[model samples]
Target: KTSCPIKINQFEGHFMKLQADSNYLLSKEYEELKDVGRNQSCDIALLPENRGKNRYNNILPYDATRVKLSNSDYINASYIPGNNFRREYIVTQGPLPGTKDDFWKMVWEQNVHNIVMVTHYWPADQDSLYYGDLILQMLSESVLPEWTIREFKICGEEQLDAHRLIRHFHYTVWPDHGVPETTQSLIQFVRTVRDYINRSPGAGPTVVHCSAGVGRTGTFIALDRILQQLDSKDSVDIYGAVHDLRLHRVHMVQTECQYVYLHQCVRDVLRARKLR
Candidate 1:
């Protein structure tokens, strides 16, 4: 179900040879989407009542794997299971000021500790009246050229005095409808996130978000999964991973550029590993 047409190490030269007509080759990969298993139905989110809950009209989670809350069973997020990891992600859009409570509810109920945010529009100060009952205060901050890390204490008011130390990783350089400036930084960002998650004690799926929650969100999730697969089994399947992702949610790796970027990032990471 998951093997790459190009070997992990050889993909660099393989794609290099076809680099002149890379656009065509990449386009072909997308055309093969017909063969990929995809679930495009969004019946629950499409209902009149749920329309406002969706951040974007076109990008909505599949009903089959959408994350459900106890009282209100709707969030623009989906439970995406990774290669060997079961339900490794609860991917969703950045919460609007109004929907912030619902977003935190998913985190509070989902047992999530690592919150990876790929979008820069962080809305206002996150602690400024954000969410119900729960008080989210930033504990600390560390910055990198491509991303930032913030530790926060997500504690309840009257609900309970207990708190969770949620690690917030924010990727800042990804442009809207585009890829990062440097593939190296992007890979480092992915690896940094993976390392942090592995060391973290929480067992819930990592909550990953971007504006629309499909494009970059999917790219991050897919890269994380494939990198793990590469480590788990010395092979990687960019297309297969993305295809499987679409089955859980619509448009996992959204564009031709993004799909190709995944290959480039994998290639670079392998080359970098060979260096030392």
Candidate 2:
């Protein structure tokens, strides 16, 4: 796969298979909407944005017609400091079945209208790693190729028009190769995303994932929550937000440190703000 292009064109496609089981979780979150695709309550933008706006707005409201990624999905609504276009795509891509071109093509087909990002899983070595030839071709392309989308290692590419390139990054759990590092690379990743989102006006949404899009994915989400809350103390309700996340996908922000990191980021941000 290293020799192959990342197939981000397919990354823009959709995988509707994920939503098949999603209604059950959405229904669980919203008691009234128990049947499959039978409820408007689960849709945050569709729902009363005032009450749950903070949490629900973070993700794009679900669409019955659109395809969903097994590992990650998009958020459609606009967010401040950044015109949120649901421009982000999250998924679990590694050396396995999920990372295949067919899968990426599905994602590409699905997200043709907007920018599509990809977040792959961990536990991969340089051999089976996803970012290699495809990434190089992506970088070398004269005009942005569909497969070349994303902001992961494309430091120079960040200057490209946001409309043309998709911001992408891959997250890996430390010790995957038996290294057992306490601060996973995700620590830098989550903070990098925070910097991207907070610093840039009209910054785009970011994609994140691990093997299952649960544990490591949760850490990413939780870190965002922490930073957002830190920036605006009253901006987010942590408990309420986490509760909603758990409702949407079980076990979001999986590890103890992952959970603690949210509040810690809040504290750190607050202290920095105070000193400033």
Candidate 3:
């Protein structure tokens, strides 16, 4: 069932009005979204020291996708179901130093084909964890100002004779607290991922992650979904989409700026399609 209106009305114009507002109206709407999941806690999130490895405080329930780790029972990740798009996703936190292997294990066990990294890190310092060669090889990279697309192959200890290929799309433009300069690059990047996903039939859930796995991760997912709706049904419900997303995973689209950004991004997609 779709919650979007029959036709999207004055989307870009309304966004422009909101963007130029004197008052912090977007922030108010953001607060309401946050209020739904406030004071929520998961026991697993409080268990051992590693349980605290989560980038965000709120944890998904046992009903969510649980990654059974050999080292630690806790791996901060959740399986978000597919909506309008056939592609499902496993939204997880960036890998900490100690949790790198566990992250690889999840990738292998889940049979994920693509890993869309929305965060960046340095290999020398290891302060942040990007992609690893534990179970894959970096064959090539398509670098861009806004994002970097890398190709990898699985050539681990046990599986050396044969290998599976995976695409790693790292979006590098988004700032920590605010939205990107323009939605052009991000929208193009989303389309790039969507096209790749559509080509790979029977591929596993795409894994999306950022520093905290909430803010940018949620925003990206919301934008992807809203655009998907716009393309499929010629309409979108930004509110209903985010509301449903938060139900599966808490703190998605983490701020007022991100919430507003989704509307902007959706309008961009609609314009590109000449549907606006």
Candidate 4:
């Protein structure tokens, strides 16, 4: 409960503290989430080749967070419970070419309103085009450099809604194993995504991904949870938060750099809010 302050004067000190303890933080995380044999099974999750594409070989979804599709009976996403019982999030790898339709199918079945993508399509990186605005008949609602909001209609036998609308917020800049060039853009993007979340209170879990689900994906979700904690509890437990999250999905906040960036992002947000 006695975490470091986000104030500018305290920022460096807090960062130093994190840097000093990051190894311990990661050690704790690995020890806790590494023992998956007792509670995790990959037989069902890996049965479909497309679902396993580019997904971490060792990290299996916890029995609790794994999504179960009705038709194909396969999924590679994990439901990460957020702070204060906020709607959980589905953190997964970018959908492979073969898994694109299955990805949309999972979206329809889950009733997700917001899909936050932190990576780019082939133009921006080596990742595939998982959610094309036109592919599978998805209509483009709006597009910007920072994000793409789209609406897709359900077809075939499983018709959950007349038109299953979902917002795809893709941050096209952030690099792998690194922070964005500056925090301003990322923060602004988060504001847009959260606004959607607030508007749709009972919507299903927000789907977030990058090339892999653990690096940028974990950082984004971890920051979101910590920010919520600041709002509700006036304090943060970065280590504890990451520890609990890794239980649902492995290697969240994947690197020490990302772990430190979490503090910086929190500091930036608190300053903007005048809470520091």
Top-lDDT structure, candidate number: 1
- What residue runs in model 3 are displaced by over 4 Å at the alpha carbon? 1-6, 9-29, 37-40, 55-66, 84-87, 120-134, 155-162, 272-276
Ranking by TM-score: 1, 3, 4, 2
Candidate 2 segments exceeding 4 Å error: 1-66, 69-95, 110-136, 140-164, 171-188, 194-205, 233-236
Candidate 4, after superposition: displacement of residue 147 in Å?
3.3
Looking at model 3, report the run of 10 residues with the lowest lDDT sum.
120-129
| Alpha-carbon runs more than 4 Å astray in model 4 | 1-13, 19-43, 46-59, 84-87, 120-136, 153-160, 274-276
Give lDDT tens digits, candidate 1, residues 119-141: 83232344534457666777678
- Model 3, 28-125: lDDT tens digits are 55556665544445666567675557655554433344455544567888767556433388888887776676677677666778888887322332
- Score candidate 1 by TM-score against the native: 0.88
Superposed on all Cα atoms, the candidates' RMSDs to the truth, in angstroms, are 3.0, 16.4, 4.7, 5.6
Q: How do the residues 38-152 of candidate 2 rate in per-residue lDDT, one tens digit apiece?
A: 2423353344532332232333333432234334332222211111234342322232433343333332334322222223322122232333212211322122321232332
Best by TM-score: 1
Cα lDDT, all candidates: 0.78, 0.36, 0.69, 0.65
TM-score of 2: 0.45
Tell me how many residue pairs clash in candidate 2. 28
Clashes of each: 0, 28, 0, 0
Between candidates 3 and 4, the lDDT winner: 3
Quote the positional error of residue 150 for candidate 3 in Å.
Answer: 1.4
Report the lDDT tens digits of candidate 4 across residue range 19-76: 5654564344335534433455556555556344435656556556677767556667
